[PDB]
Each structure stands twice: as structure tokens, then as C-alpha cells.
Design a protein around this ligand. Structure first.
Ligand SMILES: [K+]
Ligand SMILES: [K+]
Ligand SMILES: [K+]
Ligand SMILES: [K+]
Ligand SMILES: [Mg+2]
Ligand SMILES: [Mg+2]
Ligand SMILES: [Mg+2]
Ligand SMILES: [Mg+2]
Ligand SMILES: [Mg+2]
Length: 153
RNA sequence: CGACUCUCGGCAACGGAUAUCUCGGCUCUCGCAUCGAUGAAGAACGUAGCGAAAUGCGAUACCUGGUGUGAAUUGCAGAAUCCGUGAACCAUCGAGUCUUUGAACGCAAGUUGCGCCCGAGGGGCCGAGGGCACGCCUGCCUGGGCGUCACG
């Protein structure tokens, strides 16, 4: 499989991938943006804190109508942030896959950082909703593809 | 320096255009003349070692028989067959079978409902199997009426 980015150090890097994951694309894009050059161990602790409501995820685009918390005040002075648990758990699973792929290669888990993370839109799935005056409207999910490369340096 | 918005490029997405095809369609021309009470067209239900549909067939049920060809069928498995009266999800057709219906015909019908007759075969009982609609034609049998007569 070809990712959108080459490792540039293919021997010293590990990758993980997920297609058509049933999690909101807009929520996962912000989660992926919050850990762009993060070290692997700090990324895991950050995502567990998000799961535990101790650290918020900053919502910069796709942010209209998002509350303000003060847990996100650093690196987002307006309080716009949230705690997307499903999008955090899905990324955590990918981080554990790439981590074990690195262990097979023998790269040390320490000094590993996310050199590439990407969320792309999957094909949408169809459901239905009913409206007043006998009308039917779409009721759609927005799944995503997630790509992840860990690198030593 | 960063976020946001806009923009340019590279890669990845989304989507199914374009290109090349085509056991289909459309148009034209030719030949032939063959449905049914000997039950048609249509409808239903069944039928395979594994099938729902389509295709095929009818309790002989993806087939029996004859002829032809001549070694397959296959998705899986088991059987049969090979210098042979002999394989085939083969071709073809003269021999057969052909459930419930339907013009549909004992009477009906949102009913597998309600009758009558004959009868192999084992007085009566049990029978397998089969009959019993309407209109009409020729002939036939049994009849009706002083309608027209004849003789008693
Ligand atoms: K709000
Ligand atoms: K672009
Ligand atoms: K085309
Ligand atoms: K009745
Ligand atoms: Mg509101
Ligand atoms: Mg409603
Ligand atoms: Mg209504
Ligand atoms: Mg067939
Ligand atoms: Mg009838």
C-alpha cells in the first residue's frame, strides 16, 4: 500500500492504516491535527487524557457551535475544544498497531514520533429519517480513512 | 512566530466521466404456413445428493425411449461407462409419461367444499380405474296431441 507520504527513512519507520472506520470524519481530523509531530509516548498519554476528560482537543476548523472549556486554553486561546472519545479510541488503536510493527522491526519504542498522520473521507453510508408531512430525509454517517507513520527521526 | 480564511503545486481521497469493447438493441430484405373439447394460450403447485431465481421438466418430474455422434459432466462429491448395444448439463426425433387448473365440461368456489352412475379385483362390504356440461347434425329407441286421415 502507498500512503500519501513516504517515510524518508523507511528502515527507521513503521506504518499503520485503517479504511472505512465508523467514526465521524470531522471529529477525527481535529484529533489527528492535535498530534502532528508528537512523540509516541506523549501522544498515547494525551489521547488517554482525552478519553478521561482531563485534556481537551482543540477544534479550529469544523468548529462552529463548539463550546468553550478552559482545558484547551493553552495552544487555543479561545476556549473552543472538545473530547471526542470515539475518534480518540480509533487513533489509539492505530498507534498500538504501528507500535507493534516497529517492535518487529526492532526500533525502540522510545524516540518514536508521529511523522505522518492523515484522515481522509470514506464512502458515506445511508440511513433514513422521517419528517413532518410525510417526507423522508437522508440520515448519513461520514466514515474516514486514517493513515499513520511513526518515525525514529 | 502560530491559528483562521483564500490561493498555487505534489501525493492521497471521493466520484464514475473519457477511451477501447459488446453472446444486446434498432432498421432493411428473404423463406415458410404449423394453436385448441385428441383440451390450447394463460395461471398454480411440485420436481435435483447438495437450488433460491432464471432455464428445463411433470409423481416416469433439470428427465424415460429411439436414432446420431463417439469419451465426457464438472462448483463439490459419489456412481456409471471406454477396440463399447457406449460417457455426455451432447445433437435430433418418429416411442412414452404428462399433477391442479384454465374455452373448462356433474354442481360450485375467499370451500382442495357438495352430489350421482359404472366398475376391474378381493349377497353385502372394500375397491384400482373411469364416467355424468351446453348447443347442434345424421341415424335410432321410447313417447305426446282427434293436428290430417283410413278401416273397424
Ligand atoms: K456553542
Ligand atoms: K490542493
Ligand atoms: K465508454
Ligand atoms: K356451497
Ligand atoms: Mg445552539
Ligand atoms: Mg421525525
Ligand atoms: Mg404518514
Ligand atoms: Mg436447466
Ligand atoms: Mg371448473
Amino acid at each position: 500500500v502507498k500512503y500519501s507520504t513516504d517515510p524518508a527513512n523507511p528502515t527507521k519507520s513503521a506504518k499503520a492504516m485503517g479504511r472505512d472506520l465508523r467514526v465521524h470524519f470531522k471529529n477525527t481530523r481535529e484529533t489527528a491535527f492535535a498530534l502532528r509531530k508528537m512523540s509516541l509516548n506523549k501522544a498515547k498519554r494525551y489521547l488517554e487524557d482525552v478519553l478521561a476528560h482531563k485534556q481537551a482537543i482543540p477544534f479550529r476548523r469544523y468548529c462552529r457551535g463548539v463550546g468553550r472549556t478552559a482545558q484547551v486554553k493553552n495552544r487555543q486561546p479561545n476556549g473552543q475544544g472538545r473530547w471526542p472519545a470515539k475518534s480518540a479510541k480509533f487513533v489509539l488503536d492505530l498507534l498500538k498497531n504501528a507500535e507493534s510493527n516497529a517492535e518487529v522491526k526492532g526500533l525502540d519504542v522510545d524516540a518514536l514520533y508521529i511523522s505522518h498522520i492523515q484522515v481522509n473521507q470514506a464512502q458515506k453510508q445511508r440511513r433514513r429519517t422521517y419528517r413532518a408531512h410525510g417526507r423522508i430525509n437522508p440520515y448519513m454517517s461520514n466514515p474516514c480513512h486514517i493513515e499513520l507513520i511513526l518515525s525514529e527521526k
